[PDB]
């Protein structure tokens, strides 16, 4: 069923809450034993958001290999993503260790450091060129190279140096700065424009490691980003674009991380984004 007609059907009948609860009921349940070990309590932001054991990213260290991060591997679309929580004061060094070890080119941030008067993640990158950051626990140096501030997003060029080997790499930071404190955006236009800038940079392409994408918990806004990207790519690849089933794609992604798409409003917004974005994929 053309998702555009499915959309009007659900909208007129006002059944978004019912549709969303069906997804919650059918979603996969896999163990997350490592996340729940006592030694990892201060590595998790939220008690009820954990990576599954089978898809979690492992840090390359013998001490403690745990980070709250998951590999979402989309086989037909030929795209992979790492979804993670906003870094905590005690995990900023782990976060950049992951970026280094997984050979990522881009980091996608979908929240502000403070929202609703509370801290949603650590200030984990430098704000001034001449004030670099050193992460002593993981032996990395991070320098701000340039910053481009736009009305709806900011793009930063960063240099990450492995102090052990003195290799350096350029990382691109894509920061969507205008998601509202409550609800979802009224129009998907600026979110889609942002997605296309990430694509244009190479950060999603197979010559690099998977992009790292986060919000506060790494499941809601973060799930909207990867769901929209994968659905649009499938509509490009297939003979019949109307065969793409957003609910089925979301359930596939939920095999790799729990809770993706946190509200019925985020589900509706994901539909709207794919419907409007297709009016470029289909040619325009």
> CA 195, CA 237: separation in Å to the nearest integer?
18
> CA 209, CA 146: separation in Å to the nearest integer?
22
H, E, C per residue of the chain: CCHHHHHHHHHHHCCHHHHHHHHHHHCCCCCCCHHHCHHHHHHCCCCCCCCCHHHEEECCCCCCCEEEEEEEEECCCCEEEEEECCCCCCCHHHHHHHHHHCCECEEEECCCCEECCEECCCCCCCCCCCCCEEECCCCEEEEEEEEEECCCEEEEEEEEEECCCCCEEEEEEEEECCCCCCCCCCCCHHHHHHHHHHHHCCCCCCCCECEEEECCCCCCHHHHHHHHHHHHHHHHHCCCHHHCCHHHHHHHHCCCCCCCCCCHHHHHHHHHHHHHHHHHHCCC
- Determination technique for this entry: X-ray
216: annotated binding-site residue? yes
Catalytic residue among 121, 215, 226, 231: 215
Contact status, residue 184 vs residue 215, Cβ threshold 8 Å = no
Return the C-alpha torsion angle 247, 30, 263, 187, nearest 10: -50
262: annotated binding-site residue? yes
181: annotated binding-site residue? yes
219: annotated binding-site residue? yes
Structure token pair of residue 125: 């990158």
Q: Which residues contact 171 (CB under 8 A, 6 or more apart)?
A: 99, 104, 105, 106, 107, 157, 158, 159, 160
Q: Is 215 a catalytic residue?
A: yes
- Burial of 132 per CB tally in 10 Å (0-12, 13-18, 19+): middle
Write down the domain spans for the chain. Answer: 1-284
171: annotated binding-site residue? no
Strand partners of residue 253: none
Pairing of strands 168-176, 79-84: unpaired
């Amino acid at each position: 069923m053309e998702m555009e007609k499915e959309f009007e059907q659900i909208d007129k009948s006002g059944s978004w809450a019912a549709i969303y609860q069906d997804i919650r009921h059918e979603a996969s349940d896999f163990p997350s034993r490592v996340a729940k070990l006592p030694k990892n309590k201060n590595r998790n932001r939220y008690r009820d958001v954990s990576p599954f054991d089978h898809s979690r990213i492992k840090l390359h260290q013998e001490d403690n290999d745990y980070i709250n991060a998951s590999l979402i591997k989309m086989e037909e679309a030929q795209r992979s993503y790492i979804l993670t929580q906003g870094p905590l004061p005690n995990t900023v060094g782990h976060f950049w260790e992951m970026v280094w070890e997984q050979k990522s080119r881009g980091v996608v941030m979908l929240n502000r450091v403070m929202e609703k008067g509370s801290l949603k993640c650590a200030q984990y990158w430098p704000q001034k060129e001449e004030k670099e950051m050193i992460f002593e626990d993981t032996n990395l140096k991070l320098t701000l190279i340039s910053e481009d501030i736009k009305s709806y997003y900011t793009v930063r060029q960063l240099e990450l140096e492995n102090l052990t080997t003195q290799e350096t790499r350029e990382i691109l930071h894509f920061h969507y700065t205008t998601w509202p404190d409550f609800g979802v955006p009224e129009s998907p236009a600026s979110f889609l424009n942002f997605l296309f800038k990430v694509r244009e940079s190479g950060s999603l392409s197979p010559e690099h490691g998977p992009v790292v994408v986060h919000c506060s918990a790494g499941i809601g806004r973060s799930g909207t980003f990867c769901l929209a990207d994968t659905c649009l790519l499938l509509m490009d690849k297939r003979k019949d674009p109307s065969s793409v089933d957003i609910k089925k794609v979301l359930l596939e992604m939920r095999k790799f991380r729990m809770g993706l798409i946190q509200t019925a409003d985020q589900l509706r917004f994901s539909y709207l984004a794919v419907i409007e974005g297709a009016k470029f994929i289909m040619g325009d």
